[PDB]
Amino acid sequence: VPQLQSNTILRLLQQVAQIYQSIEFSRLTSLVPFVDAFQLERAIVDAARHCDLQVRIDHTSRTLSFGSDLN
Amino acid sequence: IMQNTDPHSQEYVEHLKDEAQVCAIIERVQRYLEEKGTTEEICRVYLRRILHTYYKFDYKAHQRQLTPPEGSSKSEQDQAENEGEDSAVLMERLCKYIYAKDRTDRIRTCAILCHIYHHALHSRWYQARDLMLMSHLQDNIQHADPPVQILYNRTMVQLGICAFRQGLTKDAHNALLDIQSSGRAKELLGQGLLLRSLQERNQEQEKVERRRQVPFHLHINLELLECVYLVSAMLLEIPYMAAHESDARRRMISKQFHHQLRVGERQPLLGPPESMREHVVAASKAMKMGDWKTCHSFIINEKMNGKVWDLFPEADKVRTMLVRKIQEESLRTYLFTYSSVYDSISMETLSDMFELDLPTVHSIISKMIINEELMASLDQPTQTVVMHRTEPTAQQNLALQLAEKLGSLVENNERVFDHKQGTYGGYFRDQKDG
Amino acid sequence: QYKNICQQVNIKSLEDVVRAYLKLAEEKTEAAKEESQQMVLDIEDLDNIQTPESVLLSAVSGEDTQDRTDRLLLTPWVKFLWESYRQCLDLLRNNSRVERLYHDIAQQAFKFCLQYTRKAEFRKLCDNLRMHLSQIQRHHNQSTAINLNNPESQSMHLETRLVQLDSAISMELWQEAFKAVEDIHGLFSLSKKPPKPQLMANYYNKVSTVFWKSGNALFHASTLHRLYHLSREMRKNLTQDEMQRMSTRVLLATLSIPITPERTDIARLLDMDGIIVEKQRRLA
Predict the structure, then answer these.
(1) Is the CB of C217 inside 8 Å of chain A's CB atoms?
(2) Is B133 exposed, middle or buried (0-12, 13-18, 19+ CB in 10 A)?
(3) What is known about its processing and modification (chain A) (predicted)?
């Protein structure tokens, strides 16, 4: 179950790159019921680092940019 | 006696009790020869007193460092028995006398090796290094007797273990490389014969090699040696393999680590690790993924503690140093592997994710940028690392690798052209330069 | 000498004798451990436990006192038993005609390996494989006239299976389990002439379970669905009137399924490159 929970999160994380073009991290927290943000951001940055999505989740303001195309 | 008793029987512990009486007899004979002896008899007793002291970790000197004298009053009688001359000061006095009075290059050579071993055993790396370098024994030891070569090999392992205890993973790897890559470490350290070489030797040579074995209480565990070597290789080779995954010129640092990793990757079923080698291979897979917490649980479990880490006189200092080195180099493998996905990262989230101090994180990232290892800029007011989106695509990487290979093919075509133009070179160089 | 005179004559004697032999040796090792593990083990750590005078110095490359002196008074029994089991049925009955007892011997060996040293597994397993090869690829003696005798066949099969499976998935072994699976596959290949009896479902489920973690819940979930399908055939033939069962089945299925949507091929992305795909095909 815990991996399959993360797999459902992984499913959600892929979609919202097409639903949104940017999103504030504070909005992004409330969208997703989960144990902790400090945990989950790293699991997104992990997925992002393993090239499953492109995000600028780490950023000075602490806000995320999916981007229309960019490259 | 201590070569012919079994190492795992209770009788070994019984015959080791007599070692205290041997040490006391040698002290009685030392004091007697300091008053009446010739300088050549004194230098020989000093070597025998050194020989039973250089391998013993001074728990009394360490206990005297663990209790600073804050405030309880007892007895001037308990002070006179505490004036026991430190094993280190005794070692330094006896060794300096040998260096200044010895007419034989043998006793001097054994004394400097025991002195270096005793500094290395007590974490005193700089003193042990500077004595080893000053000796120039690296060139000369090939012509010394095999028991002195066994002492030198044991002192070189102890220097590598001392460098490792000081977090000097590179110098630890270098000192242990030739000994472990030989596949003959047990013989080079005088700890036994390898059963696979029993088929190729004369029984008379075997009977002389058995007499050259050191007693078991002078052994350095080969599993501890191989664990320290493989962990030192892991911390050097994984950051290098992550940064240079894209390069065609893969410079393997450790051929033995690369062999062990390829053996673990060839097992179709990888169970939970049981062997010390499987634990370091499992940790190496976790460390390539940048997860320091599974790396830590494979290196610091109860099985590896009782097998490797509890064999150290300072287990918790080497544990905390090794945790910090796993965090420091896993932050680097994580940055090398995931740079391609990040546009900006804060140093605050890297401090929280790796449980590392912000000045250390800043110093590592600053050094990767200065080494051209990371294509990033550091914003000082926000404490963010902003990546430069200049990373080559898999097609750009294949073009870069092809450009390096074309440069190597030009360099080799130029070499072949010079060898062709050199003719055929035999008939046109004999009439200009008297 | 005994098997000879008791050859094409009476086996009942050999059964009683060799069972009574291994039973006498088992009790000598039982006594030998307790002896060393109650009297001598308490003699060891007996009294205090501080300062050994020479116990702390060897603490840089040693173990506990119980293993240090249990080796003096138990290792004998264990060693003896192991050797006997190896040379006993093995070096005296690596085949022959009938007479199972072999199953019991195998079980005993497995138990021993589990308890005492584990290395024995490698030796025992090796011997077993060699024997299976000699026959399967031997066929040259008044031995078992293979053909349609699934009795002994199925027997030995299931036996080794359960023994191998648990064995490996017990002492944290894995290569042993792999070898066992390979052997079972080979048997199926050379033993696919018959339709298919029970136990099948049993083994299937067992394996899928033992897998689950090690491998990804992908192949594991696949094996789970395979066992689920087996429950259908076995049902039409097994007949299981239980809803809870179906529920559990569906649950296991789901999980093993939703778990991983992609694999992180780091090793591959690094080296080029397998030498790491055909093996997956083999697992499939």
Answers:
(1) yes
(2) exposed
(3) Phosphorylated. Phosphorylation is enhanced upon serum stimulation.
